[PDB]
Amino acid sequence: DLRLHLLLNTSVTCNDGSPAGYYLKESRGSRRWLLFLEGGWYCFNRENCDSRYDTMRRLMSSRDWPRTRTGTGILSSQPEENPYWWNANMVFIPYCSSDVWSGASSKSEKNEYAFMGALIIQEVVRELLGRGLSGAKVLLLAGSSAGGTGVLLNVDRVAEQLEKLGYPAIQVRGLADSGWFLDNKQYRHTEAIRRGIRYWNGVVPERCRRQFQEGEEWNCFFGYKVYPTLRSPVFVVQWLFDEAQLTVDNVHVQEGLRLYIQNLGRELRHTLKDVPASFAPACLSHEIIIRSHWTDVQVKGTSLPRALHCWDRSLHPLKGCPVHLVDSCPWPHCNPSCPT
Numbered sequence: 001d002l003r004l005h006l007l008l009n010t011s012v013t014c015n016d017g018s019p020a021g022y023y024l025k026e027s028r029g030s031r032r033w034l035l036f037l038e039g040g041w042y043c044f045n046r047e048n049c050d051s052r053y054d055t056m057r058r059l060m061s062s063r064d065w066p067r068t069r070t071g072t073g074i075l076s077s078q079p080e081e082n083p084y085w086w087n088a089n090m091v092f093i094p095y096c097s098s099d100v101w102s103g104a105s106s107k108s109e110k111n112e113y114a115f116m117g118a119l120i121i122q123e124v125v126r127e128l129l130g131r132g133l134s135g136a137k138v139l140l141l142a143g144s145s146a147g148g149t150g151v152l153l154n155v156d157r158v159a160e161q162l163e164k165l166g167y168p169a170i171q172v173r174g175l176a177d178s179g180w181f182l183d184n185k186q187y188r189h190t191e192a193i194r195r196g197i198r199y200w201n202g203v204v205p206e207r208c209r210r211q212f213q214e215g216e217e218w219n220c221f222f223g224y225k226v227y228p229t230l231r232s233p234v235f236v237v238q239w240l241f242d243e244a245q246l247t248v249d250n251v252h253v254q255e256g257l258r259l260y261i262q263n264l265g266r267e268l269r270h271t272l273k274d275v276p277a278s279f280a281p282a283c284l285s286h287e288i289i290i291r292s293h294w295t296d297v298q299v300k301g302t303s304l305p306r307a308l309h310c311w312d313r314s315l316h317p318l319k320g321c322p323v324h325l326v327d328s329c330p331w332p333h334c335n336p337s338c339p340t
Ligand SMILES: O=C(O)Cc1ccc(-c2ccccc2)cc1
Pocket: 039, 040, 041, 042, 100, 144, 145, 146, 147, 149, 178, 179, 181, 193, 221, 222, 244
């Protein structure tokens, strides 16, 4: 069990003005820290955010949060469930800003909701330094879905925050799960993100912002465009046929759809060709790293916890311990280890 702490700085809030927070489980014999960003879509205007407030309120407010949460998958402390980092300090950061972790705007006379995802991450790091993070050797910022995109948007800012605070020895790294999307043609007929950024006062990494410039920051929400600009090491986990990618493409088999789906897998494989640390199975699924059975899937005979351990060794090519694992077969579930 991870225990809830609401932020001491009560000006850093969820959408409705209630305090943000984090769930923590310490491991006093470890210098590794895992900070995980929850996912869950987003909202981009008043009417669409009001709808989410009615039936997805735990993603907009801390008022009903439980005092504890069970750590699962990579957040599990049992070696059998988590061969990778079972002895690490574990942090689960709930997603209650509906802004893909990009916002920096308070609730005010002119704003019905607060969008503070980027400031939530910064404040969690700040308060954790007084609970042990000051002694860390590695801080892994991880996340699934919208939290996976959040890793790409925020990993370099966490690294810069710690350098300016006087902690140059903590190695900051990223793990982005199910957050690597394509701005492709739909099967049946980017605007929502463009409007979202203005609604949220969204912020993107600095080098990417300077490339695309004013009005075009939406580009930095797409993995294959923002990743080459990042300086921190980032491991990318991405199903080739992601269910949320297919949803935004209006896919739910004859030749037209077969060719569409095969081309989608090929395009995703191409964007990952020069990503040295990556895990990309040919499955129709969504999210993996906090699922209890996340140890089950394999690419070319190597599991995800093993690939992550090999990544750890590479940051000290390795014989029999690979870090770049991308399927080549062209149809969902051509890999036998895909989730049932
Ligand atoms: O959160 C989910 O369960 C699915 C999901 C993941 C990422 C994004 C996303 C938003 C903006 C830019 C890129 C990705 C949207 C939905």
